[PDB]
Design an enzyme around this catalytic site. Structure first.
Site, PDB file in Angstrom:
ATOM      1  N   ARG A  34      33.470 -47.591  99.484  1.00 29.09           N
ATOM      2  CA  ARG A  34      33.408 -46.435 100.376  1.00 29.09           C
ATOM      3  C   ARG A  34      33.145 -45.182  99.549  1.00 29.09           C
ATOM      4  NH1 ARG A  34      34.787 -47.765 105.422  1.00 29.09           N
ATOM      5  NH2 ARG A  34      36.283 -49.444 105.861  1.00 29.09           N
ATOM      6  N   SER A  38      27.967 -42.876 101.763  1.00 28.63           N
ATOM      7  CA  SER A  38      27.558 -44.272 101.648  1.00 28.63           C
ATOM      8  C   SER A  38      28.719 -45.234 101.898  1.00 28.63           C
ATOM      9  CB  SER A  38      26.985 -44.576 100.245  1.00 28.63           C
ATOM     10  OG  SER A  38      28.016 -44.525  99.254  1.00 28.63           O
ATOM     11  N   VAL A  40      29.224 -49.459 101.009  1.00 28.67           N
ATOM     12  CA  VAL A  40      28.602 -50.509 100.209  1.00 28.67           C
ATOM     13  C   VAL A  40      29.151 -51.857 100.646  1.00 28.67           C
ATOM     14  CG1 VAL A  40      28.244 -51.382  97.898  1.00 28.67           C
ATOM     15  CG2 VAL A  40      28.305 -48.905  98.261  1.00 28.67           C
ATOM     16  N   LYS A  55      23.688 -50.914 100.104  1.00 24.08           N
ATOM     17  CA  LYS A  55      24.219 -49.569 100.122  1.00 24.08           C
ATOM     18  C   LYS A  55      23.667 -48.855 101.340  1.00 24.08           C
ATOM     19  CE  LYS A  55      25.169 -47.911  96.165  1.00 24.08           C
ATOM     20  NZ  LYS A  55      24.754 -47.649  94.734  1.00 24.08           N
ATOM     21  N   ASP A 143      27.154 -40.444  85.333  1.00 25.82           N
ATOM     22  CA  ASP A 143      28.434 -40.901  85.872  1.00 25.82           C
ATOM     23  C   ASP A 143      28.821 -42.229  85.228  1.00 25.82           C
ATOM     24  OD1 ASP A 143      30.737 -40.715  87.445  1.00 25.82           O
ATOM     25  OD2 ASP A 143      29.784 -41.528  89.240  1.00 25.82           O
TER      26      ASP A 143
END
Length: 315
Positions: A34, A38, A40, A55, A143
Site C-alpha cells: 500500500r 498505488s 501493489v 502496481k 530511494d
C-alpha cells in the site's frame, strides 16, 4: 471542473507513453503493498502462468507516471532491475496498472546471523550492478533501502525495485530534497544541498550495508533532521560534517555547529559482538567507511565500489 467528484474525473479522460495492453491478460491475487498513489498486488500472466507484480495507480500525476515508464524502459536491458512487462488501463475505473516481473523477497531483517559474508557481498554487489547501469544511463534511483531490494536467500538473486522516485540526472541541476526514506537520507538531503548527484544512491546503499553488518535496520536514528545529522556524526565525527557544510555553503544552526564540534567520531567501535563478528571483516568495514563518506563527491562511484577487495571472491 470543480463540481465533479474525483471518481467522475477519472471516468472522463492524459496520454501514456506506452502501447497499452489488455487488462484481461493478467490476473490479480493478494495485495502485497500500500502506497501513496498505488496499491501493489501479486498476480499471474494468464496464458503462461508466469508470476508478476501488478502496481495499480490512480490516474493522476500522469507526468510522473510517464517519467517512471520512460526510466523503466531505459533500464529494460539492465541487470538486477525490475522489468516493466506491460502497462494497462482499466476501461471502467481508468486506473493504470504497471505489470512488473516478480522477484521473491526474504526480508533481510529476519535473516540476521543467517546471511554470511558471501550473502552480503552478493546482495550488495547485485544492487551495485543495478546502480552502475542506471547511473551510466543517467538515472538515479533516490530511494535505495531494504524495502526496495528484493533478495532471494536460497537462490541469491537480487532486484532493485520501486523506481517511482527515480529521476534523470543532469549535472548542476537542482533537485528536490524530499526524496529517499527517513534514516536513509544522505547529508546532502538533510542539509538541503539541491545539486545532489547519483552518489546519493551510494550513501543509501551504505546505510543498508551498515544495518546488515551490525544487525540493526534502519541503522541510523534521529527524531528530526538536526538529530539525524548529530546521530550520523557520533560515528563519523562532527568535523567532517562541519567541513562538508563549509565546502558547499550549507547552513547549520549555530546550536548544531557547537554540538558537532563535541563529536570526534566512534566509527564502528562498540558495534561488533559475537553474533556479527563473523561478517564484520576488515574489507567489509573498509567498504562501509568509503560508502558512508559524508562528502557526496568523495564517495566511490558504483563501478569503483564494485572494484573493492570485499568483492574479489564473487567476481
Amino acid at each position: 471542473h470543480m463540481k465533479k467528484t474525483s471518481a467522475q474525473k477519472y471516468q472522463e479522460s492524459d496520454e501514456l507513453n506506452y502501447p497499452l495492453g489488455n487488462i484481461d491478460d493478467y490476473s490479480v491475487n493478494n495485495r502485497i503493498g500500500r502506497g501513496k498513489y498505488s496499491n501493489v498486488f501479486s498476480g499471474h500472466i494468464i496464458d503462461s502462468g508466469k508470476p508478476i507484480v501488478v502496481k495499480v495507480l490512480k490516474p493522476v500525476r500522469i507526468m510522473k507516471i510517464n517519467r517512471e515508464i520512460a526510466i523503466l524502459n531505459v533500464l529494460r536491458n539492465g541487470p538486477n532491475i525490475s522489468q516493466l512487462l506491460d502497462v494497462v488501463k482499466d476501461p471502467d475505473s481508468k486506473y493504470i496498472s504497471l505489470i512488473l516481473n516478480y522477484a521473491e523477497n526474504n526480508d533481510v531483517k529476519t535473516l540476521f546471523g543467517k546471511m554470511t559474508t558471501r550473502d552480503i557481498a552478493l546482495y550488495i554487489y547485485g544492487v551495485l550492478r543495478a546502480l552502475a547501469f542506471a547511473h551510466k544511463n543517467g538515472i538515479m534511483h533516490r530511494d535505495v533501502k531494504p524495502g526496495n531490494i528484493m533478495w532471494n536467500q536460497t537462490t541469491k538473486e537480487v532486484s532493485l525495485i520501486d523506481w517511482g522516485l527515480a529521476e534523470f540526472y543532469t549535472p548542476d541541476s537542482e533537485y528536490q530534497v524530499r526524496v529517499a526514506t527517513k534514516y536513509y537520507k544522505g547529508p546532502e538531503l538533510l542539509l538541503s544541498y539541491l545539486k545532489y548527484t547519483p552518489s546519493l544512491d551510494i550513501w543509501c546503499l551504505g546505510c543498508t550495508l551498515a544495518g546488515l553488518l551490525f544487525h540493526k535496520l534502519p541503522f541510523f536514528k534521529g527524531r528530526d533532521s538536526n538529530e539525524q545529522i548529530e546521530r550520523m556524526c557520533v560515528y563519523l565525527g562532527g568535523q567532517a560534517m562541519l567541513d562538508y557544510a563549509e565546502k558547499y555553503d550549507l547552513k547549520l544552526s549555530s546550536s548544531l555547529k557547537a554540538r558537532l564540534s563535541e563529536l570526534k567520531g566512534t566509527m564502528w567501535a562498540g558495534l561488533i559482538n559475537e553474533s556479527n563478528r563473523d561478517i564484520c571483516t576488515p574489507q567489509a568495514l573498509d567498504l562501509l567507511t568509503k560508502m558512508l563518506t559524508i562528502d557526496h563527491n568523495l564517495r566511490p562511484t558504483a563501478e569503483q565500489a564494485m572494484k573493492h577487495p570485499f568483492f574479489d571472491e564473487i567476481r
